Design a protein around this ligand. Sequence first.
Ligand SMILES: O=c1ccn([C@@H]2O[C@H](COP(=O)(O)OP(=O)(O)O)[C@@H](O)[C@H]2O)c(=O)[nH]1
Length: 453
Amino acid sequence: QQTVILYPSPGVGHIVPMVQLAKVFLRHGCDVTMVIAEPAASSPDFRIVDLDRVAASNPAITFHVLPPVPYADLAVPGKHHFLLTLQVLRRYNGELERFLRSVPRERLHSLVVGMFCTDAVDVGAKLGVPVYTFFASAAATLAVVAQLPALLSGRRAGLKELGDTPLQFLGVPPFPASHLVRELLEHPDDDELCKTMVDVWKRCTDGSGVLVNTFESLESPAVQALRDPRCVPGRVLPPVYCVGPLIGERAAETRHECLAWLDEQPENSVVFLCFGSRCAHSAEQLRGIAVGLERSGQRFLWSVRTPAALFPEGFLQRTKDRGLVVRSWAPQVEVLRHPSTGAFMTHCGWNSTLEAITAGVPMLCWPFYAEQLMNKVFVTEGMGVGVEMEGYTTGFIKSEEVEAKVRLVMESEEGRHLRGRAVALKNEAQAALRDDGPSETSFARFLFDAKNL
Ligand SMILES: O=c1ccn([C@@H]2O[C@H](COP(=O)(O)OP(=O)(O)O)[C@@H](O)[C@H]2O)c(=O)[nH]1
């Protein structure tokens, strides 16, 4: 009876899909231990998932928190929190190796690492254990990451010099250079975060294979590119397996309020607004959204974080028969699949994008950071299941644009065709997940390959 070791990167978007991956391993007769490397206590992702609650919810998974590593020396004023996180994660590889040596060797099936824990491949390599990266982003994003070394090698300036000039990667929709992850727009030699982030992320292909949280029919060109010898000249990439979509007190009350209210709304009527595990609009922006939402006349369910006075006077009273505003953390997956939900105003994180795709809900795209601006292009231009919200790169989206785009998705003929394409993709997501469907077949091919290694 073998044990898979799951070793996620920090953050809701890395841990939540890994828990779902764990359930797949369990369904296939593996034991699971999920090894948790906590970031620095100053990380916005520090204990953002309540692991005590997660363990209680999944008693068949063994959860193991690694002993802490020193980092105060690195925690200098002004350091980008993600640079500190990348450095801290490299420092955990000693504790990870001590833990892995504590497990009877013959019982180890594989090591599956998050996409910012890739240096742990050296630990599995040394122990003779197959290592896989769990890539929690799109397959197109993986295809970009694989091709970024070649793009950056000849350069004497950062990609910021290109402005909105399109970047072209094999298998990937063109997207403006400015929409690349922002930190990668600096010259690698000029910015430690750029160099470190590229050096870490690029190693997702240095193991035995990659488990991607996507379904092949959503991203067929990107999956083809990853198997194409030109993708990374002079290199054969390991196997890529599309195994998704893998979708997973005060919050308990909020969830109850949300779903009971949605149950009383007409089908496809509600605009849901929810912006990631940690994005927050300014107070001024929240007011602007509220005015556009009210003006649109549509029903809405709006998850609001306190900025990091919110609404016009009387906004809540006037909208009480068509809208519900809740605080801070909403049951997003259950809202998205609710038949009353008709649109999703999103920050375009990949889990959120997959959740909406799998539910058949068209998107109003408001990307903030990470690869969210890339996801926005993939959703609006590649997939065609969302719309842009003008001003998203400028620091303020006007109430006129909020109303215009809510009405476009919810009332216009263009919106109806958009919804129809979203429903088609939902159907494909469901096909991917059916018994003996593509994502089970892919997971089975991964299990065969890992056993044979
Ligand atoms: O109020 C909220 C905000 C976020 N989420 C979940 O938080 C995840 C966010 O992950 P994503 O990759 O979209 O973006 P990130 O937070 O990493 O930027 C998703 O699974 C959402 O369903 C949620 O359930 N309720």
